[PDB]
Amino acid sequence: AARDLICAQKFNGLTVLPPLLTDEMIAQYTSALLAGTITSGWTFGAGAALQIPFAMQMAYRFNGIGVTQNVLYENQKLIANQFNSAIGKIQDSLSSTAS
Amino acid sequence: CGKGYHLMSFPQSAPHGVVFLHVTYVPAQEKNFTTAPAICHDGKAHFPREGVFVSNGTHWFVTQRNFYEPQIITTDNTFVSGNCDVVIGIVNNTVYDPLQPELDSF
Amino acid sequence: LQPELDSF
Numbered sequence: 001a002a003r004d005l006i007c008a009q010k011f012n013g014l015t016v017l018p019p020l021l022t023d024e025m026i027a028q029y030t031s032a033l034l035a036g037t038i039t040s041g042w043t044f045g046a047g048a049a050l051q052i053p054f055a056m057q058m059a060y061r062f063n064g065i066g067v068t069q070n071v072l073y074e075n076q077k078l079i080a081n082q083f084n085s086a087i088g089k090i091q092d093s094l095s096s097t098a099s
Numbered sequence: 100c101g102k103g104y105h106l107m108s109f110p111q112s113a114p115h116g117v118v119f120l121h122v123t124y125v126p127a128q129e130k131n132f133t134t135a136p137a138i139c140h141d142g143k144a145h146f147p148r149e150g151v152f153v154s155n156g157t158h159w160f161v162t163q164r165n166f167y168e169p170q171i172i173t174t175d176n177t178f179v180s181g182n183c184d185v186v187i188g189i190v191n192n193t194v195y196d197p198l199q200p201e202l203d204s205f
Numbered sequence: 206l207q208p209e210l211d212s213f
């Protein structure tokens with residue numbers, strides 16, 4: 001019945017080309033970046049991937065901002081709970097707010 | 100400034116542009132090791148000042164992260180913060196004191 | 206450092 005906007009654009013010579021990287025391959029890049037971040041650290045971006053426990057990586061991250069290692073190693077569960085609550089808050093804010 | 104840990108750069112002119120030679124540092128030959136976040140000695144937790152604790156199976160060493168240069172564990176490169184029942188993954192080992200054997204040796 | 210050498 002009513003002509004679609006996409007068909008009205010197509011019938012006058014206005015086409016849209018597809019991107020080279022599909023959504024699954026962009027997601028594969030994102031998954032590779034996330035796995036290299038959480039299992040190796042910053043070493044995979046500056047050479048080969050060097051495996052390290054995540055607690056030692058976060059202790060290095062606190063050393064990067066002028067805080068010593070005992071702050072992490074004495075408050076590991078508190079930081080884990082705060083990170084999990086932050087991720088849940090991002091999830092709830094993305095589910096509710098659409099702006 | 101180039102891929103890897105950046106060391107230097109050198110400029111060169113080019114027709115309508117510039118060319119940078121980025122001299123950088125890349126680690127080469129990895130090696131597996133067993134690590135611990137801290138060492139409980141005499142009921143006190145010891146953390147490294149700079150570096151990381153590694154072990155080749157029997158003895159523990161402390162070394163910097165970007166190069167395998169193992170050294171024996173002393174009180175000069177470790178600091179004490181609290182006891183050893185809070186940190187998870189902590190191990191039992193001894194820490195050499197650089198003063199007392201030289202004191203009795205005199 | 207001083208009390209330890211005072212002990213010795």
Ligand SMILES: *[C@@H]1O[C@H](CO)[C@@H](O[C@@H]2O[C@H](CO)[C@@H](O)[C@H](O)[C@H]2NC(C)=O)[C@H](O)[C@H]1NC(C)=O
Pocket residue numbers: 078081082
């Ligand atoms: C530092 O702040 C954290 C929260 O950011 C406090 O942890 C809370 O402590 C209260 C009472 O001890 C608990 O009811 C909460 O469940 C804790 N929150 C979390 C996320 O674990 C912590 O007590 C504060 N530290 C000090 C010394 O006040």
Ligand SMILES: *[C@@H]1O[C@H](CO)[C@@H](O[C@@H]2O[C@H](CO)[C@@H](O)[C@H](O)[C@H]2NC(C)=O)[C@H](O)[C@H]1NC(C)=O
Pocket residue numbers: 155156157158
């Ligand atoms: C792990 O490192 C230690 C470092 O002390 C090695 O022990 C030395 O091994 C050499 C020969 O490989 C001996 O000549 C030394 O006397 C040893 N030192 C001590 C203090 O015993 C050890 O061989 C290494 N390898 C393992 C345990 O497989």
Ligand SMILES: *[C@@H]1O[C@H](CO)[C@@H](O)[C@H](O)[C@H]1NC(C)=O
Pocket residue numbers: 129130131
């Ligand atoms: C270390 O151990 C892992 C698991 O056995 C192995 O895949 C890897 O090749 C080893 N060597 C290095 C240098 O990572």
Ligand SMILES: *[C@@H]1O[C@H](CO)[C@@H](O)[C@H](O)[C@H]1NC(C)=O
Pocket residue numbers: 190191
């Ligand atoms: C370390 O030694 C103490 C006392 O010597 C002991 O209570 C503790 O269980 C030991 N830790 C481990 C992991 O064996």
